[PDB]
Amino acid sequence: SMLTIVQEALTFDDVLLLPAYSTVLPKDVSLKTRLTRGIYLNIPLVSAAMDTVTESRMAIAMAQNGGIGILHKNMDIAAQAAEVRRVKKFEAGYPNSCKDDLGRLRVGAAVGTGADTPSRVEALVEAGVDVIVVDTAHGHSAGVIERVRWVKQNFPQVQVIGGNIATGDAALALLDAGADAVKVGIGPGSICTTRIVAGIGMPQISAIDSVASALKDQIPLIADGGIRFSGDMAKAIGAGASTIMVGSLLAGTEEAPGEVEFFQGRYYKAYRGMGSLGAMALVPEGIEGRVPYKGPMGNIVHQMMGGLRSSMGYTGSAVIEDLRQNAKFVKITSAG
C-alpha cells in the first residue's frame, strides 16, 4: 500500500483528562504561563487577530484580565500603529493586569508577509508593541520562515511569533528562524472551511502534541482555534500548550469590534473568518455570520478560568507547568 497515514489524529472531543491525586484547591492554583520565551501572562488566554474580535478595546480588556490581545491587520499601518498606542498609553481610574517592565498593558499585533510588512513592523515596534505575530494561513513556508528571521534580525527588541503550523517539522523550522513562540492550528477553527476547501487539517490535540513534542519547551506554543468550552482549554494545556487563542468565544462581547444588531428579538454581532469573502473584500477558506451578543467579556474570562482551575484541581496541578507535564488522557469513542 502507498497510502501514508501518519497517525490517528485526535481533537478535543476524542479525549478526557484523568483525575489524579490532589492536594490543591481550584481557588489556590496558579494560572500564570508563558506567551513567548520573554513574555509571561497571568492567565493563558489570547484574543484572536480578527477584525470581529480584537481591536484596542478588546486588547485593553485582555491585558487588564491577565492575558493579551493580538490586534488584527485588516487596517492600514497608521490605524494599527495607533491601536497599539491606545493600549500602550491606556490609564485606569485590575490586580492581575499583564504589563511590561514600564508598567504598561501589554499588546500584540498581527502582520503578514507581503510587501508592506517591513513598514508595518517598523511602525508597530515604534508604537511600543510587545510582540509581533507573523500571522499566516500556512506558517510552514519559506515566506513565513524568512519573515520571522527578518523581524528577529532587524527588531531583536520585540518578541516574534510565527504560525500557523501543525507539525513538529514546521515548529522546528520556525524555531531555527528565531521565533519566540509558535502558533498551532491548521483546520480547527470554528469558522474554518479549509478542511472542506483544501482537504487540509490536523486534529488540534494531536497537533499540539506534535509541536510540543518536537519543541521540548525551547519555546512556548499558542493553541489557536477550536476552543469551545473551558474543558477544551485544559485538554490543550495538558496536551502541551502554554496558551490558548480564542476567536468565537470572545466574539459578540461588548469589547469586540462591531455594532450590536437587533434581529428577530435577539441581539447579535458579526463573526467571520479572516479568510472569508467579506473579510478579503484565492478561494475563501472561512465563513461569515452572526454570533449572539454576550455582554462584557470579563464574565466569559472568569468562567473559562474557573473551569480550568477546576480541571487543575482534579489533576492535582498546582501551577500551569504541572498540567503540561503530568496530565494523563483516555481516548473515548463516539458514545463517550
Ligand X SMILES: C[C@@H](Oc1ccc2ncc3c(c2c1)CCOC3)c1cncc(-c2nc(Cl)c[nH]2)c1
Q: Residues forming the annotated binding site for K(+)?
A: 187, 189, 192
CB 210 within 8 A of CB 197: no
Instruction: Name the strand (E) or helix (H) holding 88.
Output: helix 77-89
Active-site positions? 192
- Give the Cα separation of 164 and 161 in Å (integer): 10
- Quick note: the x/- pattern for ligand X over 81-120, rule CB under 6 A, is ----------------------------------------
Annotated binding site for IMP: 164, 190, 224-226, 245, 247-248, 271-275, 285
Sign of the torsion angle spanned by Cα atoms 107, 288, 241, 159: negative
CB nearer ligand IMP, residue 66 or residue 185:
185
Is residue 166 close enough to count as binding ligand IMP by CB under 6 A?
no
**Shortest reach from residue 74's CB to a copy of itself, in Å:** 20
For residue 156, the one-letter residue type is P
Q: Which residue has the cell 479549509?
A: 194
| Residue list 146-185, contact with a copy of itself (CB under 8 A) | 165-167, 169-170, 173
Residue nearest ligand X, Cβ-based: 275
Per CB under 6 A, contacts with ligand X among 180-199 are 185-187, 189, 192, 194
- The Cα 28–Cα 318 span in angstroms is 8
Looking at residue 99, what DSSP letter applies?
B
- Using DSSP, state whether 53 is helix, strand or coil: coil
Place of cell 469513542: 333
Neighbours of 196 (CB within 10 A): 11
Q: From 30-38, 64-72, 236-244, 249-257, give the range in contact with a copy of itself by CB under 8 A.
A: 236-244
- Minimum CB separation from ligand X for residue 8, in Å? 20
- Residues 305-324 contacting ligand X, CB under 6 A: 310, 313-314
Give CB contacts under 8 A, 24+ apart, made by 277-286.
279/51, 279/74, 283/197, 284/193, 284/197, 285/137, 285/192, 285/193, 285/194, 285/197, 285/198, 286/189, 286/191, 286/192, 286/193
CB of 112 to ligand IMP, least distance (A): 13
User: For ligand IMP, what does the binding mask look like between residues 279 and 308, x meaning CB under 6 A?
Assistant: ------xx----------------------
The interface mask with ligand X, positions 245-284, x = CB under 6 A, is: -----------------------------xx------x-x
C-alpha–C-alpha distance, residues 98 and 104, integer Å: 8
Please check whether residue 96 is in contact with residue 42, taking contact to mean a CB–CB distance below 8 angstroms.
Answer: yes
Judged by beta carbon, residue 160 or residue 279, the one nearer ligand X is: 279
Measured in Å, how far apart are the chain's first and last C-alpha atoms? 32
Q: Judge contact between 308 and 234, C-beta under 8 A.
A: yes
Q: Does 138 bind ligand X (CB under 6 A)?
A: yes
Which residues form the interface with ligand X (CB under 6 A)? 22, 26, 137-138, 164, 185-187, 189, 192, 194, 274-275, 282, 284-286, 310, 313-314
Which residues form the interface with ligand IMP (CB under 6 A)? 48, 50, 164, 185, 189-192, 194, 224-227, 245-248, 273-276, 285-286
